[PDB]
Amino acid sequence: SLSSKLSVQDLDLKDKRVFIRVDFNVPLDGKKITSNQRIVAALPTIKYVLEHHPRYVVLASHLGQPNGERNEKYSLAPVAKELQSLLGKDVTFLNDCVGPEVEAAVKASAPGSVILLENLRYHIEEEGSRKVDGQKVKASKEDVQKFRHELSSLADVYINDAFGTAHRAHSSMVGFDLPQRAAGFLLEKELKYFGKALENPTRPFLAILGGAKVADKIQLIDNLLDKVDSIIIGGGMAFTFKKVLENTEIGDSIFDKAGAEIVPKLMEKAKAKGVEVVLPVDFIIADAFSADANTKTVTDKEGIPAGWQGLDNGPESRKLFAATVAKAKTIVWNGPPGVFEFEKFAAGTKALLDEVVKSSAAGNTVIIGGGDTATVAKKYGVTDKISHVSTGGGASLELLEGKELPGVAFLSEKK
């Protein structure tokens, strides 16, 4: 159970050597943080720990893709400075995550110190491999164990707060053999929500899916079909389901050739489980993929003329989706119903967004788990209205498509 794991909140931190794997993978531009969102998100854990007077707090993370080689372009130095400002406490920055220098520095620290180590991925043994000439140069089991040995040396307790990496069995996610591997407030939140949704869902459990390709979400639908009561399929995804199941004439809309092969299968299953599949009955077409393109509403039956392409949810579909949402007690949403980047094609997304929020207002569990689906919530400033906007990215998907997460499995049980 994603929900049975140990929390930071259960740990006895006093005078302990705490190690926290955090997600400080922020965007840099010329060695400067374009977005400090991730640093800000990590603060609660860091602050809660510090209040219990640990001997010291070692923070580690990765940034960009150094590729197991020391590359200045992906140094965590800037991050160290932003955190010091944001935290309002000094942060010692070490040029590495392992070695005598680190050991020394760490050992000479003052109580309550906050050490941030250099980019874990400067070492090939973190990921356990490296790309050289396109091929995957794997690291030797001995070196991998050495690295994990050195890393663990620095701590007495281990806290994971990097959900975004929990789906990889990297040295920092699964190499800490301590008696207590706990969850940080950040990752606990993801575990609590996705936990309920996938374990004891308050039916009806609905799932809104949308976006561009169906091919990337084949494993997602399949698994969810064993879970949900009804599922809505919107966006550029729906065009494949409609041309296949209903012979709908789609114009120059998104068609996933490979995904069309599976559509009958997922549908057979949907029926098998008695899952209610809601699809778009009408769309807003455009003569070109641009904010300045001529629109025109058409429907299921009228179809879409050649040249034209549907870029948003039509009026009837909005009524249809609004209804479905309004009947659910648990909602997990990933993917916008239309090309919301353009105001002309933003109606469907807005309509849906309002409904979901209203459902959250009702006191229903709404879980956003999409990149652009979170951006939508941020844009309309409703983020605080959604029960949970996940930050797991690839980990969130994998979790939803069935997979068991190494970083999560490795944690201790509540006790």
From Swiss-Prot:
Residues reported in the UniProt entry to bind Mg(2+): 212, 215-216, 372
Ribosomal protein keyword on record: no
Main subcellular location of this protein, as a coarse class: cytoplasm
Any single GO BP term: gluconeogenesis
Pfam families given in the database record: PGK
E.C. no: 2.7.2.3
Outcome of mutating residue 21 to K: 2-fold reduction of Vmax
UniProt keyword list: Acetylation, ATP-binding, Cytoplasm, Glycolysis, Isopeptide bond, Kinase, Magnesium, Metal-binding, Mitochondrion, Nucleotide-binding, Phosphoprotein, Transferase, Ubl conjugation
An example molecular function term from Gene Ontology annotations: metal ion binding
Function: Catalyzes one of the two ATP producing reactions in the glycolytic pathway via the reversible conversion of 1,3-diphosphoglycerate to 3-phosphoglycerate. Both L- and D- forms of purine and pyrimidine nucleotides can be used as substrates, but the activity is much lower on pyrimidines. Negatively regulates the biosynthesis of acetyl-CoA from pyruvate in the mitochondrion.
PANTHER family recorded: PHOSPHOGLYCERATE KINASE (PTHR11406:SF0)
Subunit structure: Monomer.
Family: Belongs to the phosphoglycerate kinase family.
This protein's name: Phosphoglycerate kinase
Organism encoding this protein: Saccharomyces cerevisiae (strain ATCC 204508 / S288c) (Baker's yeast)
Source taxonomy: Eukaryota, Fungi, Dikarya, Ascomycota, Saccharomycotina
Name of the gene this protein is made from: PGK1
